[PDB]
Write an enzyme that holds these catalytic residues in place. Structure first.
Site, short mmCIF file in Angstrom:
data_model
loop_
_atom_site.label_atom_id
_atom_site.label_comp_id
_atom_site.label_asym_id
_atom_site.label_seq_id
_atom_site.Cartn_x
_atom_site.Cartn_y
_atom_site.Cartn_z
CE1 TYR A 1 6.18 2.17 3.51
CE2 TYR A 1 5.46 3.41 5.93
CZ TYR A 1 5.56 2.70 4.65
OH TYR A 1 3.91 1.70 4.69
NE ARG B 1 10.10 2.49 -0.68
CZ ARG B 1 9.64 1.58 0.26
NH1 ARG B 1 8.41 0.70 -0.59
NH2 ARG B 1 9.05 1.87 1.36
#
Ligand SMILES: *[C@@H]1O[C@H](CO)[C@@H](O[C@@H]2O[C@H](CO)[C@@H](O[C@@H]3O[C@H](CO[C@H]4O[C@H](CO)[C@@H](O)[C@H](O)[C@@H]4O)[C@@H](O)[C@H](O[C@H]4O[C@H](CO)[C@@H](O)[C@H](O)[C@@H]4O)[C@@H]3O)[C@H](O)[C@H]2NC(C)=O)[C@H](O)[C@H]1NC(C)=O
Ligand SMILES: *[C@@H]1O[C@H](CO)[C@@H](O[C@@H]2O[C@H](CO)[C@@H](O[C@@H]3O[C@H](CO[C@H]4O[C@H](CO)[C@@H](O)[C@H](O)[C@@H]4O)[C@@H](O)[C@H](O[C@H]4O[C@H](CO)[C@@H](O)[C@H](O)[C@@H]4O)[C@@H]3O)[C@H](O)[C@H]2NC(C)=O)[C@H](O)[C@H]1NC(C)=O
Ligand SMILES: OC[C@H]1O[C@@H](O[C@H]2[C@H](O)[C@@H](O)[C@H](O)O[C@@H]2CO)[C@H](O)[C@@H](O)[C@H]1O
Ligand SMILES: OC[C@H]1O[C@@H](O[C@H]2[C@H](O)[C@@H](O)[C@H](O)O[C@@H]2CO)[C@H](O)[C@@H](O)[C@H]1O
Lengths: 262, 267
Positions: B80, B180
């Site tokens: 992130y 992801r």
């Protein structure tokens, strides 16, 4: 945090043609047959199984036990204490196999008929040997998008890749707990290759023989593998218009990469 | 502490195509995980306890063929975005804990001077600050070009907070979320292939909010899988519950570390 504390979930085990692993007539007496039966909505212990930390699968206090370590013997329910310790033992694999570690004699269903007694057989990775622990009794209906954003489409006996008209002569697929990929409008028809070697013969032929070659795994790397032959689904030449999905070894190119779009 | 130099993957939205999107994301994915820990076939990211700060962040340089360029710092342990550098300036989301705030110190050490936001980069905050939910913000190549320009002009002074926050939601979804999940990556490649600007479907929203939840569920699963169904959505807002790992294997590409294997060995 911690070493991964693993559990013991109470789950159904679904397998050939969608039928759940069942303790016959609902009775637990030592020796009763585990069989294939229609999946039930409710909570009758005879279709629910606890995957224990010690590797035994238990419906209502008793273990799923193999009669002996030979191709052909049936699987029966049995009190776990009385029963020969490593005959009550089973491993559940990511690729849908429940093995009993004494060679690779595998939980199997040799007819996909309601009421068939479960046997253990040598591991040829067939549809009659793919199982899924899940309380979700319906298969997963997906669209499979592959080369150049084109969809996999079946039109009666053949399958090829074409463009996604999101309503079309279908291209929606049901992905079963036994490891088969079935054309959603005709669900007793299977994505079939008389694999071992290769080429187009990824046809749509009945699920009934339940062969290795009708069993398929969607892997992490985007390929659709034939567990047995070890080859992946491949669009011949990267050419959509040849209308042939062969079976071929993994190189990794776009014509072997697929995606389940739900 | 830090010498070394963090890793840099660059993408350009300039003559962007489904292959250069696809190779940008394999390059990001291959830079987040070290190959060591795969569990039920998906990669697991490093554990933030055991991690040197030089191994901690990777750098993504994005640009326009329309001039500008910005560099986003991805955190290796959850894939992130922690912040970015634009020109002579470096801006970071507000660390939510003491260990992280020390770490962020090592990110763009040459800059004139670093600025730390008052808010976090969790979507909840960003979407309140954009005045718009992720379902109203469109995704596609043409949205990321715009976002690189908005990011770039917050350094100078165009600034405007709703728009910065809306640009952050577009970047995180088209890089972190696509790294992801191979589902969200392919969703973004469908938009690039047809030049679509499209708000994400309910399917995409649910996967994103379930990333940490699926990572726990798969890691403390058994063999086969799991103690509780994770409920998810279809492209149309529907139904289903997942009780096992096999459906998840072609859809999660990376997992955050939750617990060690039963010794260093498994899956
Ligand atoms: C798929 O589908 C099946 C069937 O729908 C689901 O089955 C249920 O599973 C849940 C959770 O896995 C089961 O719930 C728990 O069973 C516990 C049994 O405990 C023993 O407890 C006492 C001491 O507390 C012992 O002496 C005695 O031996 C008891 O038998 C209960 O403890 C749980 O409930 C009650 O717990 C609290 C705190 O103890 C009590 O105070 C309250 O009374 C509370 O209500 C709970 O029942 C449940 O039994 C299963 N249903 C069935 C078969 O009855 C599967 O979970 C689902 N699978 C997945 C993976 O989702
Ligand atoms: C369907 O799904 C299952 C999932 O397991 C697959 O089965 C296993 O396949 C693996 C490969 O993933 C086979 O692997 C080899 O495993 C052997 C040992 O691993 C055990 O030992 C360690 C610790 O000592 C345990 O931690 C671990 O948990 C296992 O219990 C090794 O013998 C191999 O290592 C050596 O291989 C060569 C030597 O020739 C060299 O690379 C090195 O020497 C290396 O050390 C390798 O790790 C495993 O044996 C399979 N069986 C089982 C029961 O696990 C199925 O294969 C898959 N189906 C298909 C078609 O893919
Ligand atoms: O074996 C088939 C089917 O049997 C159900 O059990 C019946 C049983 O067959 C009947 O003789 C008895 O009177 O009542 C039982 C409950 O209906 C099982 O419940 C079902 O699981 C199947 O296993
Ligand atoms: O024959 C199946 C095999 O073909 C490879 O591709 C060649 C093709 O044979 C021919 O038309 C020409 O040489 O160009 C194609 C592109 O490489 C495929 O790579 C392979 O996946 C299979 O589809």
């Amino acid at each position: 945090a911690d070493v991964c504390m693993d559990p013991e979930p109470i789950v159904r085990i679904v397998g050939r043609n969608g039928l759940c692993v069942d303790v016959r007539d609902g009775r637990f007496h030592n020796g009763n047959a585990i069989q294939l039966w229609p999946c039930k909505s409710n909570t009758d212990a005879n279709q629910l199984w606890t995957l224990k930390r010690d590797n035994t699968i238990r419906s209502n206090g008793k273990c799923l036990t193999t009669y002996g370590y030979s191709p052909g013997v049936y699987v029966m329910i049995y009190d776990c204490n009385t029963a020969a310790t490593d005959a009550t033992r089973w491993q559940i694999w990511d690729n849908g196999t429940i093995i009993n570690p004494r060679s690779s004699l595998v939980l199997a269903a040799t007819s996909g008929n309601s009421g068939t007694t479960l046997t253990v057989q040598t591991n040829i990775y067939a549809v009659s040997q793919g199982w899924l622990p899940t309380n979700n009794t319906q298969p997963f209906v997906t669209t499979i998008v592959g080369l150049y954003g084109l969809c996999l489409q079946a039109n009666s006996g053949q399958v090829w890749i074409e463009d996604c008209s999101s309503e079309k002569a279908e291209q929606q697929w049901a992905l079963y707990a036994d490891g088969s990929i079935r054309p959603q409008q005709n669900r007793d028809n299977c994505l079939t290759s008389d694999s071992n070697i290769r080429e187009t013969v990824v046809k749509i032929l009945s699920c009934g023989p339940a062969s290795s070659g009708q069993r398929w795994m969607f892997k992490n790397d985007g390929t659709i593998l034939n567990l047995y032959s070890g080859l992946v689904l491949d669009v011949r030449a990267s050419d959509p218009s040849l209308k042939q999905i062969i079976l071929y070894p993994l190189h990794g190119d776009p014509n072997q990469i697929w995606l389940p779009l739900f | 502490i830090f010498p070394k130099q963090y890793p840099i993957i660059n993408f350009t939205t300039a003559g962007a195509t489904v292959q250069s999107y696809t190779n940008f994301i394999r390059a990001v994915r291959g830079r987040l995980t070290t190959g060591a820990d795969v569990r039920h076939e998906i990669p697991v990211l490093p554990n933030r306890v055991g991690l040197p700060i030089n191994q901690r962040f990777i750098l993504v340089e994005l640009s326009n063929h329309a001039e500008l360029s910005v560099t986003l710092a991805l955190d290796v342990t959850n894939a992130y975005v922690v912040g970015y550098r634009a020109g002579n300036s470096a801006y970071f989301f507000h660390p939510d804990n003491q260990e992280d705030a020390e770490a962020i110190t090592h990110l763009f050490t040459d800059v004139q001077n670093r600025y730390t936001f008052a808010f976090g980069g969790n979507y909840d905050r960003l979407e309140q600050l954009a005045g718009n939910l992720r379902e109203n913000i469109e995704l596609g190549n043409g949205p990321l070009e715009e976002a690189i320009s908005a990011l770039y002009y917050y350094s100078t002074g165009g600034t405007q907070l709703p728009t910065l926050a809306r640009s952050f939601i577009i970047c995180i979804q088209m890089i972190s979320e696509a790294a992801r999940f191979q589902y969200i990556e392919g969703e973004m490649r469908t938009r690039i292939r047809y030049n679509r600007r499209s708000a994400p479907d309910p399917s995409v929203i649910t996967l994103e909010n379930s990333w940490g939840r699926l990572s726990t569920a798969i890691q403390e699963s058994n063999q086969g899988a799991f103690a509780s169904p994770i409920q998810l959505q279809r492209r149309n807002g529907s139904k289903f519950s997942v009780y096992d790992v096999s459906i998840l294997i072609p859809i999660i590409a990376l997992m955050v570390y939750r617990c060690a294997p039963p010794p260093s060995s498994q899956f």
